[PDB]
Amino acid sequence: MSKISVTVNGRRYPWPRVPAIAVCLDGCEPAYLDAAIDAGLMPALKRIKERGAVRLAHSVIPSFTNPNNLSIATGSPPAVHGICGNYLYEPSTGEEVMMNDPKFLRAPTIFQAFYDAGARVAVVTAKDKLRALLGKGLRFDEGRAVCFSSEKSDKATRAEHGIDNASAWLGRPVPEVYSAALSEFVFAAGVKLLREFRPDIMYLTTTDYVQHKYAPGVPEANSFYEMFDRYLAELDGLGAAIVVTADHGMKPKHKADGSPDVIYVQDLLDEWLGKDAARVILPITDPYVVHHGALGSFATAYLPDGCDRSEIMARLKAIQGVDVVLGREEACRRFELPEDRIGDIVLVSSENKTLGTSEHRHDLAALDEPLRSHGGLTEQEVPFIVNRVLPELPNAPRLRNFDAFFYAVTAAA
Minimum distance, C-beta of residue 309 to Zn ion, in the bound complex (Å): 30
Nearest of 80, 114, 84, 105 to residue 9 by alpha carbon: 80
Provide the CA 99 distance to its chain's centre, in angstroms: 14
Q: Tell whether residue 65 is a contact of Zn ion (CB under 5 A).
A: yes
Minimum distance, C-beta of residue 211 to Zn ion, in the bound complex (Å): 8
Q: Pick out the residues of the known binding site for Zn(2+).
A: 26, 65, 208, 212, 247-248, 374
Nearest of 273, 252, 270 to residue 261 by alpha carbon: 252
Closer residue to Zn ion in complex, CB, 66/167: 66
Q: Which residue is nearest to Zn ion (CB)?
A: 65
Q: Tell whether residue 29 is a contact of Zn ion (CB under 5 A).
A: no
Q: Pick out the residues of the known binding site.
A: 26, 65, 208, 212, 247-248, 374
Number of residues that bind Zn ion (CB under 5 A): 5
Minimum distance, C-beta of residue 26 to Zn ion, in the bound complex (Å): 4
Q: State the DSSP code for 402.
A: G
Nearest of 232, 205, 243 to residue 20 by alpha carbon: 243
**Region 321-350 residues binding Zn ion, contact defined as CB under 5 A:** none
Minimum distance, C-beta of residue 403 to Zn ion, in the bound complex (Å): 18
**Distance between CA 369 and CA 143 in Å, rounded?**
45
Closer residue to Zn ion in complex, CB, 26/261: 26
Torsion of CA 82, 340, 91, 88, to 10 degrees: 20
Closer residue to Zn ion in complex, CB, 68/76: 68
**Region 234-253 residues binding Zn ion, contact defined as CB under 5 A:** 247
**Distance between CA 84 and CA 70 in Å, rounded?**
9
Closer residue to Zn ion in complex, CB, 131/144: 131
Minimum distance, C-beta of residue 83 to Zn ion, in the bound complex (Å): 13
Q: Tell whether residue 26 is a contact of Zn ion (CB under 5 A).
A: yes
Torsion of CA 336, 339, 340, 341, to 10 degrees: 50
**Region 288-317 residues binding Zn ion, contact defined as CB under 5 A:** none
Closer residue to Zn ion in complex, CB, 65/350: 65
The contact mask relative to Zn ion for 173-212 (x = CB under 5 A, - = no) is: -----------------------------------x----
Minimum distance, C-beta of residue 337 to Zn ion, in the bound complex (Å): 17
Minimum distance, C-beta of residue 202 to Zn ion, in the bound complex (Å): 19
**Distance between CA 207 and CA 152 in Å, rounded?**
14
Closer residue to Zn ion in complex, CB, 174/289: 289
Sorted by sequence, the CB contacts under 8 Å of residue 385 that are 6+ apart come out as 45, 48, 49, 52, 53, 54, 55, 243, 244, 245
| DSSP string computed for 66-113 | HHHHHHHHHTS-HHHH---SSEEEETTTTEEEE--SGGG--S--HHHH
Pair type for strands 241-245 and 381-386: antiparallel
171: left (phi > 0), else alpha (psi -120 to 50), else beta? left
Closer residue to Zn ion in complex, CB, 111/298: 298
The contact mask relative to Zn ion for 125-154 (x = CB under 5 A, - = no) is: ------------------------------
- Site for Zn ion, rule CB under 5 A: 26-27, 65, 208, 247
